[PDB]
């Protein structure tokens with residue numbers, strides 16, 4: 535009957551059905567198939583409207599929300615085609631401190647992370663990746679590892 539968050543959608547360019555998750559922003563052709571804690575890695579792209587417009591990559595972050603989203607889109611594209619792996623992109627490009635640990639955040643339960651991240655994280659199954667997930671930090675790609 536489809537896991538939490540998943541809905542059937544119709545492709546504009548091909549007419550083929552696909553599946554979309556409105557919690558994680560994941561989308562795929564394939565038909566998809568709770569814990570106390572999950573472990574996730576993430577790649578963060580911050581923007582001018584981030585709660586802290588600063589990171590290890592640059593002192594003053596000034597890119598716009600729309601620009602950050604386009605970077606996130608491009609990374610997802612490289613991950614999905616296997617041009618670059620997630621961990622590699624997070625180490626190089628995530629505006630989070632967890633970049634030094636390949637995006638890994640360790641384990642966490644509900645009530646610890648900003649709500650959109652948390653919900654997305656818990657709706658992923660082990661091994662799955664999110665689409666763009668928006669929080670006050672910026673835009674995330676989430677990978678559930680455990």
Ligand SMILES: N=C(N)NCCC[C@H](NC(=O)[C@@H]1CCC/C1=C/[C@H](COP(=O)(O)O)NC=O)C(N)=O
Pocket residue numbers: 576578584585586630639641642646647648651669670671672
């Ligand atoms: N148990 C653990 N590890 N502590 C959870 C408490 C921190 C938590 N953080 C976040 O929710 C954002 C979203 C997902 C990752 C994340 C990372 C942020 C991003 O960097 P910032 O926007 O702050 O500059 N870094 C936090 O220092 C929060 N309640 O604000």
